[PDB]
Amino acid sequence: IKQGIREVILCKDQDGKIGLRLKSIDNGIFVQLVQANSPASLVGLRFGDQVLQINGENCAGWSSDKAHKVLKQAFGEKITMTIRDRPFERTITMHKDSTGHVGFIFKNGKITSIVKDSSAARNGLLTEHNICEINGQNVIGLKDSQIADILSTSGTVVTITIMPAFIFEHIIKRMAPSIMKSLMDHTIPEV
Numbered sequence: 227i228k229q230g231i232r233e234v235i236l237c238k239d240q241d242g243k244i245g246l247r248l249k250s251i252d253n254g255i256f257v258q259l260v261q262a263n264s265p266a267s268l269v270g271l272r273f274g275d276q277v278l279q280i281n282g283e284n285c286a287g288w289s290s291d292k293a294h295k296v297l298k299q300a301f302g303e304k305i306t307m308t309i310r311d312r313p314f315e316r317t318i319t320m321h322k323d324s325t326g327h328v329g330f331i332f333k334n335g336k337i338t339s340i341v342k343d344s345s346a347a348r349n350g351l352l353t354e355h356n357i358c359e360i361n362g363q364n365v366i367g368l369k370d371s372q373i374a375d376i377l378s379t380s381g382t383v384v385t386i387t388i389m390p391a392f393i394f395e396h397i398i399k400r401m402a403p404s405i406m407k408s409l410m411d412h413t414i415p416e417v
Contacts, residue, residue: 227311227313227316227317227387228311229311231278231309232308232309232311233306233308233309234270234271234306234309235269235304235307236265236266236304236305236307237265237302237303237304238265238300238302238305239264239265242302243261243264243265244264244265244266244297244305245261245262245263245264245265245266245267245411246259246260246261246264246271246297247259248277248290248293248294248297249290249397250288250290251393251396251397253287254277254286255276255285255288255290256274256277256397257271257272257276257277258273258397258398259273259405259409260273260364260410260411261409261411262409262411262413263411267411270415271309272311272359272364273312273358273359273364273366273410274312274313274314274315274358274397275309275312276309276313277293277307277309278307278309278310279306279307280293280296280297280305280306280307281305281306282306283296312358312387314389314390314393314397315358315359315388315389316387317359317385317386317387317388318346318349318350318385318386318388319349319383319384320344320346320351320384320385320386321345321382321383321384322380322381322382322384323345327341328344328345328346328351328377328384328386329341329343329345329347329351330344330351332357333370335356335365335366335373336354336355336356336391337352337354337355337356337357337388338353340352340353352388354390354392355388355389355391356388356389356390356394356395357373358388358394359385359387360376360380360385360386361380361384362387362415363376363412363413363414363415364411364412365412366398366406366410367403367404367408367410367412368407368412369407
């Protein structure tokens with residue numbers, strides 16, 4: 227998670243798209259969806275990022291409908307955005323035990339218990355938190371089995387990005403577990 231504000235500059239694709247769905251939360255604007263291989267993904271916009279400004283205009287108090295309309299009317303050319311990185315999220319770094327376990331159980335991407343004497347317990351992993359990212363890969367809308375698979379095919383050191391479940395569930399209000407599973411960028415970030 228980066229500590230402060232950053233400017234990103236986007237360019238709409240040939241179809242006028244940038245690959246973003248935004249959501250009004252607590253009088254702020256937040257990234258709900260980032261589409262794979264979009265301008266939003268390529269400039270490194272992430273699920274949960276806060277949008278502070280678009281082309282120097284404050285997003286405070288905007289409806290989701292209004293942020294969508296402002297992105298529509300913008301000269302495709304070059305769109306500036308001021309971003310707070312994933313402000314509702316934290317990253318926890320854990321080590322797999324000899325049997326390849328960090329030490330938790332989850333369901334629908336929500337951590338439901340912590341295993342006694344595990345790296346999850348030593349690192350203070352919390353329950354009632356949704357998994358947003360594993361080693362910086364978005365896993366939102368993946369099957370539980372696929373998240374299990376991704377944890378399996380990490381090395382011993384696993385970084386999970388977590389969000390309190392209440393907040394997670396207010397953000398992914400309005401979007402079925404098929405846009406979630408199918409379109410939400412899940413790609414390993416490109417260099």
